[PDB]
Amino acid sequence: PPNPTGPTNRQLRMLIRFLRKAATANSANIWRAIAELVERPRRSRVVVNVGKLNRVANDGDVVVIPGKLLGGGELKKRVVVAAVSVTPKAWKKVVEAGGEVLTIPELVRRNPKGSGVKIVI
Amino acid sequence: LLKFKLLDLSPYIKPAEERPPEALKVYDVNGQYMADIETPIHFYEPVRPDLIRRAYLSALSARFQPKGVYEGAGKEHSCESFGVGLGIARIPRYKGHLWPRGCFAPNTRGGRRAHPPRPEKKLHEEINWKEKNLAIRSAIAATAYKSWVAARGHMVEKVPSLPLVVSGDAEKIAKAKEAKKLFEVLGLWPDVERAAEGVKIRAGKGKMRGRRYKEPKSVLVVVSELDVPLIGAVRNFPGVDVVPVSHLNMLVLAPGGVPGRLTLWTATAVERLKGLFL
Amino acid sequence: PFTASAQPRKQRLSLYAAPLHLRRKLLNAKLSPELQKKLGVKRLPVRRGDTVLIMRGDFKGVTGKVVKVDLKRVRIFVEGATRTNSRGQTVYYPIHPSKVMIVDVDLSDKARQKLIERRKR
Amino acid sequence: MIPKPVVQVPRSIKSGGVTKWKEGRGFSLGELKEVGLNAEQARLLGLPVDTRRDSVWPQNVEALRKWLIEVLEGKATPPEPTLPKVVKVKRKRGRAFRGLTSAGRRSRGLISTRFRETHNYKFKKKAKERRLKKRHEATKGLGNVLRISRIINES
Amino acid sequence: RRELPQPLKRLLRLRLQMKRRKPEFVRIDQWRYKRIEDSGWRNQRTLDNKIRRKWKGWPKPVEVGYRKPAAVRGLHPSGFVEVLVHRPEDLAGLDPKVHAVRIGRTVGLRKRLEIVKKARELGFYVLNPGKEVVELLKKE
Amino acid sequence: VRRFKRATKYRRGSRTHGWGRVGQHRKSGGSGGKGMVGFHKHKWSLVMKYGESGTGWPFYGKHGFKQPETISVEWRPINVGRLAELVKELRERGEVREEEGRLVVDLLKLGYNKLLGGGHMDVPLVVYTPVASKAAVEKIAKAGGEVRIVSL
RNA sequence: GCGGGGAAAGGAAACAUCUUAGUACCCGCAGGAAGGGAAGCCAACAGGGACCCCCUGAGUAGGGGCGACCGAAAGGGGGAUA
RNA sequence: CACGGGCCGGGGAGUUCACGGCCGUGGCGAGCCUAAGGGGUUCAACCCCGGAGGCGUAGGGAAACCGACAGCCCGCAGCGGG
RNA sequence: CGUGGGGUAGGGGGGCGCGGCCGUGGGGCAGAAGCCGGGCCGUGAGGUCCGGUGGACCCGCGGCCGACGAAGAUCCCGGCGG
Ligand SMILES: [Mg+2]
Ligand SMILES: [Mg+2]
Ligand SMILES: [Mg+2]
Ligand SMILES: [Mg+2]
Ligand SMILES: [Mg+2]
Ligand SMILES: [Mg+2]
Ligand SMILES: [Mg+2]
Ligand SMILES: [Mg+2]
Ligand SMILES: [Mg+2]
Ligand SMILES: [Mg+2]
Ligand SMILES: [Mg+2]
Ligand SMILES: [Mg+2]
Ligand SMILES: [Mg+2]
Ligand SMILES: [Mg+2]
Ligand SMILES: [Mg+2]
Ligand SMILES: [Mg+2]
Ligand SMILES: [Mg+2]
Ligand SMILES: [Mg+2]
Ligand SMILES: [Mg+2]
Ligand SMILES: [Mg+2]
Ligand SMILES: [Mg+2]
Ligand SMILES: [Mg+2]
Ligand SMILES: [Mg+2]
Ligand SMILES: [Mg+2]
Structure with a gap:
């Protein structure tokens, strides 16, 4: 087939480069794994609904989503979530659940080693 | 709110050129600084050349016309293959007095064209409406950068500031001489001069079909509404496009x-832009 | 009445196949500034008996009387713009009307004054 | 603005009880009698009149009353009347040969069934679809191709 | 002409040797047939192709083993990097130690004179001044 | 969006265009017939791969009957969790009337004709539905609301 | 455009029912368009409201060596409105 | 000792549509897209409207009819501890 | 880093050329395209320059689109040989 080329979006390309550099600098394999998951082909990119966070996260958890966060279902926990992109409904639900929405570089700057950060796909 | 729009990659990635300021400088008819206005949200969109290229290609491909050949071309002769045994190749040949002459095959002189263009061919590349509006917002954001406009090839050394915005009184100018004075005082006349001197006779067969002159693009003028006198005042300049703000599209952007077009926005057009393409 | 189509094939077809009453319009030539101040018009169709100044070509600067006009070729023979053939006979150079300026007007024709008044109006 | 009649889309058994509204052909005679006009007066005023309809909708009645009040108070101009303004009848040549008499109509099936269901209509419709390569006629065997592909991809 | 570091001098000498020994890449019977005499290399995918199979005594096929050294690839034989110049404004941004000027083939004599005078006053090695330009400058 | 070169560009110069030299590009005999044919003679192996052994049901044969669609109902059910999300959105938008001290939902107005029992109910709401499942009615009762069965 | 008469080649990997196709073609008859058009209708107990044409319903119902393959209508959105 | 070309010039062959499967990217995302068509325009471009309808959100059964998860274990990555 | 370096059918990756379009930068009567011979560059498709001929158009770069590449079909048309 036409082999995987990588994203055509320069924002995504720069974010992947940022994550690889951060992983190399801080010796944090989490950023390398997140970059590998974000680099995936568009037909198999990670998308997570907010309802899955209800199961896979408890209160006070820091979660990184290597892809888009979509607003589906109901959220009843308070969680800090970082993602490549967030839909308006997902951001609204995360906010009224008491949680926070961050960019992945913002999460990296706040926690350089990513200690306690949970990958959610 | 626009944190995902402005992705800060510090410290491992050094930042690029600064985003457009929170306010926009406004200039009068005389080219002087007059006031400020709040920057519309459209100028905070990141510049995305791939999306801009896709939207532009869609807008341009919607303009092409269907082309074809005569449906019976090369196929209406009275011909037939005469089989083997005559010492000659078994392609179809003329039946009558011109008998041995080859006919109807794509390798024969006068024969049919094997795979000609068909008028039913789909030339238009459709684009989603939200995608097209996102590309338009990206192109509008690209106009506010000096680097993108220079990379496109505009002369912006003399322009006071980008995004370039003029007062709403400029829409009353109804004469080409007055509009040229306004361009001269605002620093766009060098780019119009570049277009006027860079018009050329293009190479190839376009001259026979009505494409003799290939003219550059100089300045896109944005007014608030249709039928303003400034449109008729500026529309005769070489490479200058003038549209109302609601008629903005990728072909001019x-x-x-x-991405990155030297654009003169009127202040009223900048106010009107806040509820369009969003 | 000469095509308004922007296609060069239609433009050239109209120019080549224009009948004589249309080809008369191609004999228009600029008047001199003195003739313009005298008559109130800027262009007039070149007529036999007019005096014109040749503005281009080998015979540039030569002023003479127009001896012949050919509507079919859209050409004019100007006195002085001549040469000799191999047998010695003198022949006129065919000059396009757009390359001359009218410096004298032959106004003995009543219709010409009507055209002049129409253009001055 | 001349009001447009609002009617109920017919509630089919397939729908299961979901009902919606649509633009009707014209105002009903009961609705017009509610405001004091007959079909002739309404058509003279330019309203669309549907003498066949039996329903009477209060929203239609209110819109009619409002617009008629503007019309009578002169704040609105009624359109031209909803009646035939032209009468163009062509001379008929060869009706028997083109099958337009009663016997021809009976043989073409217009006495018994609808024009859309007559056989000549079916022939012309399928011919036009095949010539233009329209909706289903762009591919021959489309249903069988779909059936086999669904079997293969849903096994 | 252009001074190079020692590895670049050795690579340039090696590239000269490889250019001397490089075979000309022709199809089978190109010498025999006039209809294919001027054609470029064609890697013909046929049943009995012997050039592709590299039989001894036959012509040789195009391979990446014949590639010349990358550090001096594409350089002018003098060692300079050639830059195509179509007007005297093209000379801005060029380094005369590293770059040589090749005037465009369709540049007229009037512009060629200005290009040659500007390049020589700037110190550039002009590869192709032209016979007419050479005669005019000799006459000057 | 990405763009790719056509295969014919690669195939120029190759004689057979990817069809091979032994089994060249021929007419419908190379496909084993025109259209969807051969499935009981030489594509029966395909039928045994994808369909039922013995009968080869989905390729060949009849099974059962169809109830007429013009007399059957086309159902548009909605589960209780999705209904809870919808009523949350409606209450935020002001589309809900708390008529009896509780939220009131009309499935027919919303475009649904049946209530199912998937998900969770969290608020007392009254639902007007022509059909409701047992678990749906029980979960609505647990929430404190009530289901009212309307007649079509 | 309207009415009538009316194939085969090919496909079905043979072939006859079938399809191709009411097509090619033939006979007759009109207009600038033709034909259609004003409920012995459709629906289902709630209601639409002459007709034609476009998008859809939909390759769904259904027809068929139930194979190849063929194939609606009601309903909805428009053009127009008498 | 298999067939084709006397030579040279020019011409000479995987196209398009519909439907389906898949892949590479892009937009939006429990939702996505409008079709016909309508308004405007610097007039086949372009801007706006148009959600009819299609697909997804629930399956099982010939049909009548009924209608759905966070409990436990293993464990890659990752994170934490030695 | 590799006890890496053959390869038909076929699968995958990149590049050259031809006609046009959207941009951008230029050359041309002090001589464009085309043609003849030659030097240089590139593994190569090919590029570029020199001299002669010629007499008005043409080209570099980025993007896009095709009626896009011949040595052969007892190939077609034309010209011309032993
Ligand atoms: Mg032809
Ligand atoms: Mg295309
Ligand atoms: Mg050319
Ligand atoms: Mg069909
Ligand atoms: Mg062999
Ligand atoms: Mg030359
Ligand atoms: Mg095969
Ligand atoms: Mg075999
Ligand atoms: Mg073969
Ligand atoms: Mg069998
Ligand atoms: Mg049975
Ligand atoms: Mg056939
Ligand atoms: Mg058969
Ligand atoms: Mg047979
Ligand atoms: Mg009519
Ligand atoms: Mg009639
Ligand atoms: Mg039929
Ligand atoms: Mg043989
Ligand atoms: Mg032979
Ligand atoms: Mg190998
Ligand atoms: Mg290019
Ligand atoms: Mg070959
Ligand atoms: Mg011959
Ligand atoms: Mg002879």
Whole structure:
């Protein structure tokens, strides 16, 4: 087939480069794994609904989503979530659940080693 | 709110050119600084050349016309293959007095064209409406950068500031001489001069079909509404496009599929832009 | 009445196949500034008996009387713009009307004054 | 603005009880009698009149009353009347040969069934679809191709 | 002419040797047939192709083993990097130690004179001044 | 969006265009017939791969009957969790009337004709539905609301 | 455009029912368009409201060596409105 | 000792549509897209409207009819501890 | 880093050329395209320059689109040989 080329979006390309550099600098394999998951082909990119966070996260958890966060279902926990992109409904639900929405570089700057950060796909 | 729009990659990635300021400088008819206005949200969109190229290609491909050949071309002769045994190749040949002459095959002189263009062919590349509006917002954001406009090839050394915005009184100018004075005082006359001197006779067969002159693009003028006198005042300049703000499109926002066009916005058009393409 | 189509094939077809009453319009030539101040018009169709100044070509600067006009070729023979053939006979150079300026007007024709008044109006 | 009649889309058994509204052909005679006009007066005023309809909708009645009040108070101009303004009848040549008499109509099936269901209509419709390569006629065997592909991809 | 570091001098000498020994890449019977005499290399995918199979005594096929050294690839034989110049404004941004000027083939004599005078006053090695330009400058 | 070169560009110069030299590009005999044919003679192996052994049901044969669609109902059910999300959105938008001290939902107005029992109910709401499942009615009762069965 | 008469080649990997196709073609008859058009209708107990044409319903119902393959209508959105 | 070309010039062959499967990217995302068509325009471009309808959100059964998860274990990555 | 370096059918990756379009930068009567011979560059498709001929158009770069590449079909048309 036409082999995987990588994203055509320069924002995504720069974010992947940022994550690889951060992983190399801080010796944090989490950023390398997140970059590998974000680099995936568009037909198999990670998308997570907010309802899955209800199961896979408890209160006070820091979660990184290597892809888009979509607003589906109901959220009843308070969680800090970082993602490549967030839909308006997902951001609204995360906010009224008491949680926070961050960019992945913002999460990296706040926690350089990513200690306690949970990958959610 | 626009944190995902402005992705800060510090410290491992050094930042690029600064985003457009929170306010926009406004200039009068005399080219002087007059006031400020709040920057519309459209100028905070990141510049995305791939999306701009896709939207521009869609807008340009919607313009092409269907082309074809005569449906019976090369096929209406009275011909037939005479089989083997005559010492000659078994392609179809003329039946009558011109008998041995080859006929109807794509390798024969006068024969049919094997795979000609068909008028039913789909030339238009459709684009989603939200995608097209996102590309338009990206191109508008690209106009506010000096680097993108220079990379496209405009002369912006003399322009006071980008995004370039003029007062709403400029829409009353109804004469080409007055509009040229306004361009001269605002620093766009060098780019109009570049277009006027860079018009050329293009190479090839376009001259016979009505494409003799290939003219560059100089300045896109944005007014608030249709039928303002400034449109008729400026529309005769070489390479200058003038549209009302609601008629903005990729064909004027990114000629050649490349972002960053030297744009003169009126202040009223900048106010009107806040509820469009969003 | 000469095509308004922007296609060069239609433009050239109209120019080549224009009948004589249309080809008369192609004999228009600029008047001199003195003739313009005298008559109130800027262009007039070149007529036999007019005096014109040749503005281009080998015979540039030569002023003479128009001896012949050919509507079919859209050409004019100007006195002085001549040469000799191999047998010695003198022949006129065919000059396009757009390359001359009218410096004298032959106004003995009543219709010409009507055209002049129409253009001055 | 001349009001447009609002009617109920017919509630089919397939729908299961979901009902919606649509633009009707014209105002009903009961609705017009509610405001004091007959079909002739309404058509003279330019309203669309549907003498066949039996329903009477209060929203239609209110819109009619409002617009008629503007019309009578002169704040609105009624359109031209909803009646035939032209009468163009062509001379008929060869009706028997083109099958337009009663016997021809009976043989073409217009006495018994609808024009859309007559056989000549079916022939012309399928011919036009095949010539233009329209909706289903762009591919021959489309249903069988779909059936086999669904079997293969849903096994 | 252009001074190079020692590895670049050795690579340039090696590239000269490889250019001397490089075979000309022709199809089978190109010498025999006039209809294919001027054609470029064609890697013909046929049943009995012997050039592709590299039989001894036959012509040789195009391979990446014949590639010349990358550090001096594409350089002018003098060692300079050639830059195509179509007007005297093209000379801006060029380094005369590293770059040589090749005037465009369709540049007229009037512009060629200005290009040659500007390049020589700037110190550039002009590869192709032209016979007419050479005669005019000799006459000057 | 990405763009790719056509295969014919690669195939120029190759004689057979990817069809091979032994089994060249021929007419419908190379496909084993025109259209969807051969499935009981030489594509029966395909039928045994994808369909039922013995009968080869989905390729060949009849099974059962169809109830007429013009007399059957086309159902548009909605589960209780999705209904809870919808009523949350409606209450935020002001589309809900708390008529009896509780939220009131009309499935027919919303475009649904049946209530199912998937998900969770969290608020007392009254639902007007022509059909409701047992678990749906029980979960609505647990929430404190009530289901009212309307007649079509 | 309207009415009538009316194939085969090919496909079905043979072939006859079938399809191709009411097509090619033939006979007759009109207009600038033709034909259609004003409920012995459709629906289902709630209601639409002459007709034609476009998008859809939909390759769904259904027809068929139930194979190849063929194939609606009601309903909805428009053009127009008498 | 298999067939084709006397030579040279020019011409000479995987196209398009519909439907389906898949892949590479892009937009939006429990939702996505409008079709016909309508308004405007610097007039086949372009801007706006148009959600009819299609697909997804629930399956099982010939049909009548009924209608759905966070409990436990293993464990890659990752994170934490030695 | 590799006890890496053959390869038909076929699968995958990149590049050259031809006609046009969207941009951008230029050359041309002090001589464009085309043609003849030659030097240089590139593994190569090919590029570029020199001299002669010629007499008005043409080209570099980025993007896009095709009626896009011949040595052969007892190939077609034309010209011309032993
Ligand atoms: Mg032809
Ligand atoms: Mg295309
Ligand atoms: Mg050419
Ligand atoms: Mg069909
Ligand atoms: Mg062999
Ligand atoms: Mg030359
Ligand atoms: Mg095969
Ligand atoms: Mg075999
Ligand atoms: Mg073969
Ligand atoms: Mg069998
Ligand atoms: Mg049975
Ligand atoms: Mg056939
Ligand atoms: Mg058969
Ligand atoms: Mg047979
Ligand atoms: Mg009519
Ligand atoms: Mg009639
Ligand atoms: Mg039929
Ligand atoms: Mg043989
Ligand atoms: Mg032979
Ligand atoms: Mg190998
Ligand atoms: Mg190019
Ligand atoms: Mg070959
Ligand atoms: Mg011959
Ligand atoms: Mg002879």
